[PDB]
Structure formats: C-alpha cells, structure tokens
Amino acid sequence: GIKCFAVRSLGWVEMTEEELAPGRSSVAVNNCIRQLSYHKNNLHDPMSGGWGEGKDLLLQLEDETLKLVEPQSQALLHAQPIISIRVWGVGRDSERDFAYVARDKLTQMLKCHVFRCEAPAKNIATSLHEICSKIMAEL
Ligand SMILES: [Hg+2]
Numbered sequence: 431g432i433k434c435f436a437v438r439s440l441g442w443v444e445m446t447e448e449e450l451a452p453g454r455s456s457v458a459v460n461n462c463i464r465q466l467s468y469h470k471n472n473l474h475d476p477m478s479g480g481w482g483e484g485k486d487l488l489l490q491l492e493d494e495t496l497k498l499v500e501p502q503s504q505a506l507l508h509a510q511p512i513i514s515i516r517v518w519g520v521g522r523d524s525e526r527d528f529a530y531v532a533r534d535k536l537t538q539m540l541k542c543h544v545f546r547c548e549a550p551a552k553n554i555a556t557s558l559h560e561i562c563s564k565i566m567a568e569l
C-alpha cells in the first residue's frame with residue numbers, strides 16, 4: 431500500500447531531450463549517477479524545497495506519486511506523479527544509487543535526480559515498475 435525507503439539526496443543534473451532518447455537514456459542516467467557519486471556541493475540552496483543535495487529523506491511511493499518526505503518532521507517536501515517520470519535507473523558499477531528524470535513544473539527544466547539508498551537501489555526501481563505497469567494496465 432505504501433513503500434518507504436531511507437535515502438540521501440545527491441542532487442540533480444540538467445538533461446536534454448536528446449539525452450533521454452531511447453537507446454541513449456541508460457548511458458545518460460549512468461553518467462549522471464557516476465558524476466554525482468563522489469561529488470559534493472556545499473552551497474545551501476534556498477530554492478531547493480528542503481530536498482536538495484545531501485539531505486536525508488524518505489522516498490515514498492503511494493497513490494501513483496513518488497514523495498520526498500522530511501524524516502524528523504515528516505513534512506511532505508516533494509510530490510512527483512509517477513506517470514510523468516520520463517526515465518529511471520540504478521547505478522551499474524561497483525549497488526545503492528537510484529535516479530529518475532522528470533520535468534521541473536516551475537522551470538520546465540528536465541532534471542535527473544540521484545539518491546543514495548540504504549536498501550538495494552533496485553528495490554525502488556522494482557516498486558516503481560509495479561506502479562508504472564498498473565497504470566499502463568488500465569489502458
Ligand atoms: Hg522508510
């Protein structure tokens with residue numbers, strides 16, 4: 431009914447449409463994950479909705495929505511409809527890095543968000559897949 435994973439935000443990278451083309455998306459996502467894996471930006475971002483880089487978060491799946499939730503406060507920081515997630519993936523290399531791509535509602539920018547997960551990052555991909563499929567099923 432609800433799926434809830436402890437994760438840390440690693441930030442985002444801006445993507446182009448050309449990068450999200452079939453045949454190109456899995457290289458693009460692996461690159462973003464590799465790029466952010468050992469990166470750090472210590473700048474506090476006033477405009478990051480409290481779910482930006484380096485934040486401990488609950489990544490939750492409920493009601494066809496991916497939710498980012500403040501763990502101490504339980505505040506809903508971010509709600510992403512699963513239906514408009516363009517792309518998602520899991521770190522390929524030497525795993526617990528999860529990524530998804532969606533358009534930012536306010537800026538119209540395509541962004542790849544990466545999270546370091548406490549669980550196998552494939553548990554998140556697999557849960558999202560079950561929900562995507564149920565949504566496709568109703569076609
Ligand atoms: Hg959790």
Ligand SMILES: [Hg+2]
Pocket residue numbers: 443445458459460461462463542
């Ligand atoms: Hg990417």
Ligand SMILES: [Hg+2]
Pocket residue numbers: 512513561562563565566
């Ligand atoms: Hg889907």
